[PDB]
Amino acid sequence: QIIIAIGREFGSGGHLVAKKLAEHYNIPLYSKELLDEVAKDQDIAIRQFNFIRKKANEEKESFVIVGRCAEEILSDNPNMISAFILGDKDTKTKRVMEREGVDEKTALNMMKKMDKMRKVYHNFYCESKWGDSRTYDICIKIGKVDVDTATDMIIKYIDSR
Amino acid sequence: KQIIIAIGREFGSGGHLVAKKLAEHYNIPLYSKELLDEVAKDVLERFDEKPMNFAFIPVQDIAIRQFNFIRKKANEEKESFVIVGRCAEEILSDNPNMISAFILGDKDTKTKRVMEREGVDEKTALNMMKKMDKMRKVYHNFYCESKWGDSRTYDICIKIGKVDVDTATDMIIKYIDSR
Amino acid sequence: KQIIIAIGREFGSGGHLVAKKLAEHYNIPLYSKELLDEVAKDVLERFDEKPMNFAFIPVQDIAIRQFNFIRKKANEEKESFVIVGRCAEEILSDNPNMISAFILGDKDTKTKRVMEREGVDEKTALNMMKKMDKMRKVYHNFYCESKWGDSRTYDICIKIGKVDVDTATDMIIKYIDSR
Amino acid sequence: QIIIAIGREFGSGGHLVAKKLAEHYNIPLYSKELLDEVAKDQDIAIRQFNFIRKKANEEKESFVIVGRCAEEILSDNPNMISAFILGDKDTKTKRVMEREGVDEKTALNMMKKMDKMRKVYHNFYCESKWGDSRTYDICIKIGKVDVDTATDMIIKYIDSR
Numbered sequence: 045q046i047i048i049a050i051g052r053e054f055g056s057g058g059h060l061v062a063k064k065l066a067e068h069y070n071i072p073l074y075s076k077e078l079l080d081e082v083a084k085d086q087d088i089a090i091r092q093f094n095f096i097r098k099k100a101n102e103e104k105e106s107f108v109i110v111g112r113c114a115e116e117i118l119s120d121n122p123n124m125i126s127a128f129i130l131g132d133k134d135t136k137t138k139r140v141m142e143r144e145g146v147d148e149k150t151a152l153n154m155m156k157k158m159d160k161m162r163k164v165y166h167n168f169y170c171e172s173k174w175g176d177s178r179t180y181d182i183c184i185k186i187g188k189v190d191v192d193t194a195t196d197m198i199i200k201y202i203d204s205r
Numbered sequence: 206k207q208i209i210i211a212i213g214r215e216f217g218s219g220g221h222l223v224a225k226k227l228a229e230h231y232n233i234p235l236y237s238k239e240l241l242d243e244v245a246k247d248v249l250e251r252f253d254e255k256p257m258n259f260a261f262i263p264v265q266d267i268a269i270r271q272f273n274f275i276r277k278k279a280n281e282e283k284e285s286f287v288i289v290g291r292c293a294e295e296i297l298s299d300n301p302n303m304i305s306a307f308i309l310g311d312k313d314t315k316t317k318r319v320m321e322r323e324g325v326d327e328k329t330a331l332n333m334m335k336k337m338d339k340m341r342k343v344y345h346n347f348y349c350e351s352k353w354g355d356s357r358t359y360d361i362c363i364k365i366g367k368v369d370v371d372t373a374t375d376m377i378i379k380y381i382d383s384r
Numbered sequence: 385k386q387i388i389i390a391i392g393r394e395f396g397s398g399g400h401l402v403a404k405k406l407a408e409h410y411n412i413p414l415y416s417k418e419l420l421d422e423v424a425k426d427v428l429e430r431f432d433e434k435p436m437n438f439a440f441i442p443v444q445d446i447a448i449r450q451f452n453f454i455r456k457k458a459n460e461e462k463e464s465f466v467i468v469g470r471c472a473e474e475i476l477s478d479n480p481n482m483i484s485a486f487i488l489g490d491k492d493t494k495t496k497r498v499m500e501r502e503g504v505d506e507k508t509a510l511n512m513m514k515k516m517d518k519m520r521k522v523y524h525n526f527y528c529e530s531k532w533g534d535s536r537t538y539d540i541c542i543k544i545g546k547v548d549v550d551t552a553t554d555m556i557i558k559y560i561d562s563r
Numbered sequence: 564q565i566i567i568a569i570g571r572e573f574g575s576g577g578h579l580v581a582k583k584l585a586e587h588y589n590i591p592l593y594s595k596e597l598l599d600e601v602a603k604d605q606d607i608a609i610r611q612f613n614f615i616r617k618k619a620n621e622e623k624e625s626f627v628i629v630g631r632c633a634e635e636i637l638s639d640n641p642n643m644i645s646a647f648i649l650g651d652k653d654t655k656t657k658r659v660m661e662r663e664g665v666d667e668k669t670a671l672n673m674m675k676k677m678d679k680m681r682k683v684y685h686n687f688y689c690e691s692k693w694g695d696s697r698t699y700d701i702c703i704k705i706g707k708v709d710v711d712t713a714t715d716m717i718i719k720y721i722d723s724r
């Protein structure tokens with residue numbers, strides 16, 4: 045019924061958006077952590093993809109999923125929408141210092157390493173490019189605006205289909 | 206300026222219609238390549254704005270004049286406006302009153318809009334779409350270091366398809382007004 | 385044609401000198417943008433050559449004429465020549481007598497060659513290099529689907545720096561003659 | 564004295580070039596296989612990089628190395644040269660069917676997957692782009708010419724510095 049695939053730059057507030065959306069529609073939030081557990085029955089990746097596909101296509105469940113190539117995997121399911129959440133450098137830096145209790149220099153390095161890792165993971169499995177507007181239905185930069193605004197824009201999008 | 210909206214777009218996406226709808230909602234002018242072709246056709250310039258410095262490097266004069274029109278209207282006259290294309294999100298980088306949005310669509314939706322707009326068949330529609338998009342990407346990536354169509358180049362990107370032009374316009378207005 | 389050599393290059397790399405040295409070694413003409421500006425300035429064309437089909441899509445006439453000059457000289461007149469730039473490796477794709485080579489250099493080497501060539505300082509040299517390279521990349525990637533400067537676009541790429549122009553030229557000749 | 568860093572598209576003949584060059588100069592051929600062994604004293608990657616660096620910079624050894632970001636790692640060692648070996652699609656296909664005893668369809672899929680994996684590995688650790696001419700001193704497409712010709716062009720390059 046509603047599947048929301050969330051991509052995000054590290055420290056942009058993408059998890060907070062994902063969660064707020066899941067609370068709004070009262071549906072589950074799936075992540076890497078959950079899928080890691082729930083698929084011990086690159087090999088890992090096939091199991092996770094096939095799981096997201098079960099839930100989407102056959103079980104017809106509603107959920108939010110962060111990452112996991114979900115927008116590529118769920119690509120012909122007419123009930124899923126995707127969004128990529130980004131942020132201002134300074135907004136992200138503060139979010140990552142706070143969450144991880146680290147200094148500025150290290151925050152910035154974590155951001156760069158994590159965004160490289162996401163990009164690599166996504167672009168290996170998908171033909172589309174991580175972070176490019178064509179890969180998603182909506183992209184929102186959090187900075188000029190706050191997480192709640194991003195979340196509401198996404199619900200508007202979804203509620204108006 | 207008080208509100209400046211810089212719109213980029215894929216050909217056929219409905220991006221002009223969104224730009225128009227926004228200009229009407231806020232009752233401000235809509236500037237385009239067409240208008241700048243007119244009003245921008247008549248040493249101090251190193252405001253360290255990348256497209257201009259780049260334009261100046263020895264080896265279009267038109268491009269500079271248009272950039273400078275846009276920069277003056279935004280920064281010196283403090284006018285509010287909508288500007289489509291023309292590297293405006295890059296030029297007006299340092300202006301904290303500027304928002305930018307990239308409008309895109311799915312193939313079917315765009316091809317339908319283009320055939321209908323241009324009295325053309327599917328084949329042609331899709332060729333036009335690819336040419337104009339390459340054209341805009343080339344113009345943009347020549348003058349800017351950021352990448353045409355990349356989410357990081359903009360504040361908002363909205364794909365028109367699952368949602369219509371009115372829904373995209375409303376979402377841009379919400380972004381703007383909640384800032 | 386019997387031998388056709390299509391040369392691409394970074395600005396300042398020594399690529400014109402290699403093209404010249406090759407043309408002299410094989411005693412064939414050296415065609416450039418300059419010459420094509422002259423000799424190529426005066427319906428059948430869908431030889432399914434990508435740059436031409438792309439050029440034809442409705443929305444440069446010059447570009448078509450130059451592509452067609454190159455294509456005719458290669459394929460119909462069977463002439464041997466060196467051609468710098470002008471998308472020649474793409475245009476002459478199907479001609480099994482064509483080799484292509486991309487010439488590049490390290491920064492120091494290029495900046496030195498450019499300052500000396502253009503009576504210019506370091507700062508300017510490096511700005512020129514970046515502008516011309518963006519210019520060539522844009523021209524090339526607009527008309528072709530392959531990527532300017534990517535090794536897959538060419539048969540050979542040689543960085544001039546650790547080795548001189550004579551060494552690069554010899555290596556291209558070895559490639560050609562051992563085929 | 565001489566360090567040769569070899570990159571390559573899967574099935575292009577890059578290993579055969581690397582080996583022939585090592586025989587020519589009578590120096591060792593290091594690969595992933597060797598480095599895998601010789602560095603149990605992404606964590607793995609640091610150990611391998613630091614090993615290549617020892618051999619290069621401190622021990623001053625001569626060698627050929629395939630892959631392993633060697634051109635990036637050995638970047639200010641004025642005695643190393645890099646080359647990227649590529650191939651014609653049809654030449655590569657036959658080389659991979661023969662070596663791996665597989666059909667055409669599968670050869671082509673192996674090529675695509677292996678080239679994606681190399682690209683990802685390289686582009687994660689390096690700032691330069693796998694396969695781009697600027698990343699290397701020489702790039703050669705084997706197809707119009709054979710492995711021995713590629714190998715000789717590289718020796719010319721090296722011998723003329």
Ligand SMILES: [Cl-]
Nearest residue numbers: 051052111162
């Ligand atoms: Cl992501």
Ligand SMILES: [Cl-]
Nearest residue numbers: 213214290341
């Ligand atoms: Cl645009």
Ligand SMILES: [Cl-]
Nearest residue numbers: 392393469520
């Ligand atoms: Cl070129």
Ligand SMILES: [Cl-]
Nearest residue numbers: 570571630681
């Ligand atoms: Cl490699």
